[PDB]
């Protein structure tokens, strides 16, 4: 027998903008950092350095794209626990950012249709997006050299992972990314031709990301909502199977916040010192 | 801390082989012995830096006395009378001292350390008994 | 020669740690924005003079999926998040401790 | 393998179990390695499967370590062996419709 | 800090020694107000270290430099205490024992100094021959 | 540690006292000590001075092992004195000279002496280990 | 041959340039300075060779 526990709380609105936070080891500990520009998700690094503190990471919460964070030094790097595992998240870190500009117009004042204040949209530059995918495809082809690369929309599930999701100033946005992932690829592009506009809605009843449950928020702010973000990466899931006869499909993944933090913390390890060691020598203790 | 990136682990740089670290250490020891915009948060960091230094000292002193259990109190390098088993390591003296780093070496014998530590304790106990038994005559 | 055990203290060797890290940020500490407000009481100021030491010829095995810094960061963010963006209604499941 | 039976049009519950008694990332797949369901963080994701419309899960039990696959309105062609992936153990059940 | 052996004489002396052996094996085998309190706590830790180091060297005067437990060659006087080794070590705690012989310590300290002086004198004379 | 030095290091005695006098004073203090008979800115600065002195102290206590004097404040060696370094007698220097005067007097022989001390320690260890080849 | 700290009773808020410089260049003075008179030591000083 399961019984939902319901808590009623005050509903103030607050300014809400992620600040970079650095982590620092306590006395007795140190953090090792991997300095390779080509570093994998796991394995050896030959350029290793010691720091007391990590770089700052903004505590950004998002589900399909990584909206604010660091860039790869040289090339797009694709990291996965197991590239051949259909169930794993593939984290793609970009070496260039793609600007995304989201807004809620002051003229959107309709409250109901029949018995719009929740209408918003986001812009992506077309040339940045197609360039980004062409580079991603070229890297995907290193793992899938004889297969067609198809991008597609989500296969289904809760709206937080089906659509793109983010929060600006307390406003929870759900955006349609079908326009970004409907592209198909060969070594060439299959799309047409400036501005890719995504349709976004602002919602009040959302699922929790911090646990299992639902949460309801107060209705939208009257106006002037703007977000200006740098996409630095993607969360993709590969759809494989025994019948995938020469084609691989890449769909937006995510929903697991640990993956978002791994995309920034992958370079750091915390260690302790064990100064007592033993080795054979040719000396003898006098007794 | 003549050598090393850490307060503890002062016998050498990571990546140096064990023998190389020893030679470097001797030279540095000789030289040392022979004598050859304020920010408000700086207060916070100053305290943290001192805490790290104080802690390393407290640990150091503690370990220096604890090692007395094997007859190695107060020492950095302590010779014992426990024979080395080829079972623990089949490598010879020069190959490990010249080609292996300390981390590699410890990995090589990592799961024998508890056994070795036990043997060291036993040896020290017998050595102490022998001295005191002789003093019952003398 | 006869090989004998020698004990060395001050050996430059390390193992993986499982500890608590401190957070630092340049909180405004006058602003009402949530992250600055949280950081004001949760974190210390950043380091005005950080240092980095490049290690010598070493190899270190990193693994982003076994990295316990992630779990710790996750907990800090949830705590922050829930001290600010409070829902009007919070609904979570709760089950009886029965073997069914 | 575990065997679960039902008739065309029925609903069955196939299950995976963790010893953790916590919500664990898990997945369900068919014999052709097509994803059906899984746990991403706190969210339910569905794969490009013939069961996308039929498949469901009791999200409220994920913190009990119970990760069911509920298949509604069973088709005779849904009689496959389903594969659980929980933690790092695998489980298999054959469904006969 | 040392704070003795941290047992507050809540156990007898023999028990304390056994406990130390066990711990040595285990150890080797393996917010504005925070500024003010951080400094005071740190000062206390530094002070403890300085006193320790000083005393470990001062004990050289009795030939016990650098040791925690120092065995000497001064015989025990039954007049100081008429108890046996087991009676003292197994049944008394450190704060009971020191009270029992609290005012004989100045005499003992004097004897320890004298013994060390004679030992040094003897060794150096032998070394004028050898 | 011991309030004769007027400095954290240099604790064996006050500047200006003869070497002999300093040793006598130090003995007396040891007996007495063993017998039992903006504030935040400056607090940090004071601690840094104390921590640093401790670190140097410990460092040197171990570095002196190279001459066979590890862990010691006063250490006797087996290297003979060269009258060439100094023509003075033991009471002549210990009774009338201060430490600074003494160090100035033999300042340019310091590296010669240090070299000899290292050599002696090496020979001593070598001899002991050779004896232990059989024993 | 070392680097010394500067200290002053700077106000900062007065905007005067020495106070403004001192605000970050220096620290507060010692509220309780101490002086130890040494024993009969003779020391050679030379103001023209003083690197301070
Ligand atoms: C990736 O990182 C980037 C970082 O660069 C993130 O981008 C940032 O996202 C922020 C999210 O809100 C956004 O913040 C807004 O900026 C607006 C502009 O600020 C600048 O101009 C003002 C003008 O006076 C200056 O004071 C200020 O210093 C800057 O120069 C602010 O105006 C926004 O504040 C308002 O909205 C927040 C929403 O939570 C309220 O909490 C806050 O109190 C303000 O509310 C006003 O507007 C509402 C509208 O209905 C009113 O109801 C309310 O009473 C207030 O209205 C008064 O003020 C308005 C001002 O015109 C006036 O018209 C009205 O009559 C009232 O007087 C908020 O601060 C960042 O700017 C943005 N950064 C950039 C570069 O764009 C990005 O999101 C990150 N990505 C992710 C995924 O996180
Ligand atoms: C992005 O992914 C989606 C999902 O995979 C993909 O679209 C799918 O394409 C397949 C192509 O075969 C569609 O499958 C068929 O579509 C026809 C259209 O009229 C249907 O009639 C078929 O149904 C009959 O056959 C089935 C075979 O088992 C029977 O079960 C069924 O009862 C009918 O007899 C069948 O659906 C599939 O439906 C679509 N899915 C969606 C959601 O559209 C899409 O093309 C991918 N995008 C890109 C860019 O590749
Ligand atoms: C600071 C250091 C704390 C002291 C810890 C006690 O260290 C103790 O040393 C003595 C030898 O001198 C040993 O005596 C045996 C003890 O087994 C050991 O535990
Ligand atoms: C950072 C702070 C620095 C550490 C603080 C503590 C430093 C030590 C301060 C006092 C040290 C004095 O410790 C000193 O030890 C030496 C021998 O080892 C003793 O010197 C001794 O020389 C020989 C024997 O060794 C004899 O002449 C006589 O027994 C005694 O004079 C002194 O009796 C003692 O005073
Ligand atoms: C943690 C607190 C901060 C400081 C910690 C304490 C400082 C110690 C750091 C340096 C330690 C090195 O101190 C070390 O001492 C040992 C003996 O004890 C000496 O041992 C020496 O033995 C012989 C010389 O006789 C040589 O074969 C060998 O190369 C050399 O190491 C080293 O010459 C000296 O370098
Ligand atoms: C390891 O990576 C570091 C970090 O990039 C390299 O050192 C940097 O080199 C640039 C060149 O201009 C300097 O500006 C940085 O300040 C350097 N950083 C540090 C911490 O020194 C380093 O050379 C790399 N080492 C190896 C062996 O590849
Ligand atoms: C990225 O991760 C893979 C998976 O571990 C690494 O592949 C292993 O590399 C080591 C290197 O010696 C090989 O011994 C293993 O056999 C490899 N595993 C497999 C499954 O082939 C890969 O090297 C990593 N890439 C980088 C740059 O480190
Ligand atoms: C997103 O891009 C769209 C592209 O259409 C912008 O809409 C256009 O804005 C220009 C500005 O002069 C108008 O002339 C066009 O007619 C608009 N197009 C349409 C279809 O209405 C939109 O304003 C951009 N939004 C953001 C947030 O930048
Ligand atoms: C999102 O808004 C930013 C800010 O206006 C746009 O970037 C600016 O574009 C103008 C065009 O001349 C440049 O002069 C500015 O220097 C740009 N700013 C920066 C920070 O580079 C950006 O292009 C918009 N993005 C989209 C997709 O419309
Ligand atoms: C994103 O927008 C597209 C349209 O721009 C939605 O897909 C359409 O859904 C209707 C529903 O009957 C279909 O008739 C259209 O053919 C669909 N168009 C395309 C291009 O697929 C899509 O569902 C939206 N996705 C999300 C996640 O909101
Ligand atoms: C998105 O990336 C741009 C650069 O591609 C960032 O803007 C630059 O930030 C650096 C930081 O020191 C400044 O020196 C540059 O002058 C900035 N460039 C421009 C054109 O303004 C931008 O801040 C990033 N945005 C986010 C949200 O991280
Ligand atoms: C991709 O391009 C090559 C170029 O010749 C073509 O042969 C191949 O068929 C293309 N892929 C698909 C799926 O058509
Ligand atoms: C991406 O867009 C640019 C815009 O000019 C175009 O030239 C380029 O060829 C496109 N990418 C591919 C792979 O065609
Ligand atoms: C790394 O290898 C180079 C090769 O000459 C060597 O000089 C250097 O000292 C090595 N570093 C370490 C820590 O041994
Ligand atoms: C070490 O050598 C002795 C010699 O008999 C042997 O008994 C002992 O088992 C050896 N140790 C190991 C780990 O083999
Ligand atoms: C172990 O030592 C024996 C001694 O002869 C040698 O023959 C053998 O090859 C060694 N094994 C390894 C793995 O080195
Ligand atoms: C160290 O490794 C090199 C690698 O070629 C080898 O030649 C050398 O003999 C090794 N050193 C010892 C002492 O075995
Ligand atoms: C140490 O661990 C390795 C891991 O496989 C094992 O093979 C080896 O026998 C272990 N050695 C000991 C002494 O247990
Ligand atoms: C120790 O016992 C002897 C026994 O005759 C006695 O003469 C001597 O005074 C005692 N010493 C002390 C300090 O009580
Ligand atoms: C004191 O010592 C003498 C020595 O023989 C003993 O006979 C006497 O009983 C002791 N007294 C006590 C109270 O133990
Ligand atoms: C400790 O006191 C008890 C109380 O009767 C006594 O029986 C026991 O023998 C005493 N132990 C020692 C060592 O004196
Ligand atoms: C210790 O103090 C007590 C207090 O009465 C006294 O009786 C005893 O004789 C004193 N012992 C010494 C050695 O002075
Ligand atoms: C300084 O001179 C006076 C004169 O009597 C003397 O007593 C004192 O001990 C001297 N101090 C030193 C350090 O020599
Ligand atoms: C030290 O005495 C020896 C004795 O023969 C002499 O040869 C040597 O040169 C003397 N040292 C100096 C610096 O004169
Ligand atoms: C050294 O002392 C002797 C003792 O008579 C003296 O003759 C000699 O001249 C002294 N050396 C110097 C340089 O004065
Ligand atoms: C110390 O100087 C005085 C000054 O008259 C002198 O008489 C005395 O003999 C000197 N002491 C020594 C040991 O040379
Ligand atoms: C030591 O320095 C003094 C200073 O003038 C000089 O006269 C003396 O000859 C020097 N001794 C040596 C050995 O250089």
Numbering used by the authors:
A (entry chain D): 195 to 309, 325 to 359, 361 to 395, 397 to 404, 412 to 505
B (entry chain E): 513 to 548, 563 to 664
C (entry chain D): 32 to 131
D (entry chain F): 1 to 97
E (entry chain K): 518 to 547, 565 to 664
F (entry chain B): 512 to 548, 567 to 664
G (entry chain A): 49 to 100
The article reads:
HIV fusion is facilitated by the viral envelope glycoprotein (Env), a trimer of non-covalently linked heterodimers (gp120 and gp41) (Harrison, 2015; Lee et al., 2016). Binding of the receptor CD4 to gp120 triggers a series of conformational changes, including opening of the trimer, exposure of the co-receptor binding sites, and rearrangements of the gp41 helices (Blumenthal et al., 2012; Harrison, 2015; Ozorowski et al., 2017). The N-terminal region of gp41 forms the fusion peptide (FP), which becomes sequestered during the initial steps of receptor binding by moving toward the trimer interior (Ozorowski et al., 2017). Here, we identified a pocket in gp41 of our previous cryo-EM reconstruction of an early pre-fusion intermediate Env (CD4 bound and co-receptor mimic antibody bound) (Ozorowski et al., 2017) that is proximal to the FP and contains a bound detergent molecule used during cryo-EM grid preparation.
